[PDB]
Amino acid sequence: ANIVGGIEYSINNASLCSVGFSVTRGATKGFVTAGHCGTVNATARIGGAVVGTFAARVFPGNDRAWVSLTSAQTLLPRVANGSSFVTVRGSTEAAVGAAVCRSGRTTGYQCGTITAKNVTANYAEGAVRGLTQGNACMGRGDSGGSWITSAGQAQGVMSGGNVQSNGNNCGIPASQRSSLFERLQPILSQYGLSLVTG
Template sequence: MRNSRMYRLAAVAITLSASAALGTQTVAQAQGTDATPHYQPEMVRALAASLGVSEDAAIDRLDRQDVQQAKLAELARRGIADDGAFFDASGKLTVNAADSTEAARIEKAGLGARVPARGQAALDKVKAELDAFAARKAPSGAVAWSVDLAADKVTIKVNNDRGAAVKAFLAKAAEHGSAVRIVRGEEKLEAKAAIYPGSKMTFNDTSQWCSVGYGARDRSGNQYLVTAGHCVTNTLRYDGTAFAKGYKTRYALGTRSVDMGILTINSGHSITPSVGTWGNSNPVAVKGGSRAASGAAVCKSGATTGWTCGTIGSYNNTVTYVDRNGGPDTVITGLATSSVCVEGGDSGGAYISGNQAQGMTSGGPIDQQCSGVNSRGSSYFQPLDDALSYYGLTLNTN
């Protein structure tokens, strides 16, 4: 019972000091054998249902993603630079090229290519200007803004444009002409920390909670929990037992922040390198942390909504989170977006594409409700590779 309960509740299963043997058993299950399929059946089923395709088609999509990502990595090793890449709805990877010559070399390697009007580097500059402008005063009403590689534009999502700060922000954006598009009627966002009674990973002795993220280590072998920055607090508990202590965070309410943070793992505890699927058979083994391209299939495990799947949207998003307790708005930079559904308490939970760890839940629409694996929704997550790089850590893998 305790073993199955651990998988249902944990985004990444925690082995407590009182269960040393259980921790060993968990790792063995996650590692599998030669007969273990390349992708866990539960992930394939969830992804197939989420995308509305057969399980064979879901496996084919994951396989094609892996092959195309490997080709893109090989191009980089050969010195062929790209200006951003994304998967389209059919699962084809399209690469932005600097010119027709580079595009031809990319196509020869078996990938789609185009020469965009702007490309990622130029769009990143536009977004950086908007980030700097928003840092002076949070543009309440501007929900999020990000680089949309497929559209070759910076997209700004707006809930309302009546305030002086958001009007000034939109006027600044208009200076960039067709490089920016405005999408109106969006819901307000909030960080997805706990708001319900009961918990998975509780804050100190309160009933508020987040979800467990990924385990990592420093050069000395010290173990850390990598999570959303707003989930970092003095003490975190699993099943009533303190297992981690707040160490560093880049999140601060009311100021421009990055939603990443780490906690030290208490002696005798550990985080296994496998993502729980909330009762859907075996956990998904973590084999690495290579970032998947926009459009890639992804699933998330969280303490409130469990196992939900969708696709990755875009990277380098900036959002404005509101505070339900009446505190100031907080501008968060550096997030990725997805069509994965989340609710309060899912923050910090693990995103994984195939067997590659992607990140931790940051936030989503305030009143979003999820109804199971196949729920369609939206969410923002902190990319794991950025957090590992910033803190100088190495992901624990299976």
């Protein structure tokens, strides 16, 4: 499969999440995603085929994971934006007030701005701390997907937020959305990964 930020993948033939970013760990290919999407060794499938397994994750506390892929996967430095693509150029962290977009299998590519950093989400499973908050909308299924600036600086992966009864926060004003992402920097250093760029 071609690995691109934002696309759908399933875990153990049950849950759906979105790919965050293609990365490598020495000769191993992989992608970063949300830790709540799977447990270590869960099987990831893309378009019905097995592409790899969860190699490590932390959730709750943090919300991060990486999936190691088979050699036959093609890693690409890109995030989906409809039929088009945003090129991944690096991981400079943007500041509060910067504009950012996110991509995932449920609401597609949505943009907004970063409104706060170091937020704690109190999930049923336990608190997740240190998340960055943006106001781009999102929905169930977007978890694990990419958060990137138009300039190509990868920011983090979708963790969670205030979904409404219709499964997303797109029907409420940006001023009322809380869409939280796990910062990418700590995930790359915690697992020794390098981002694929173009």
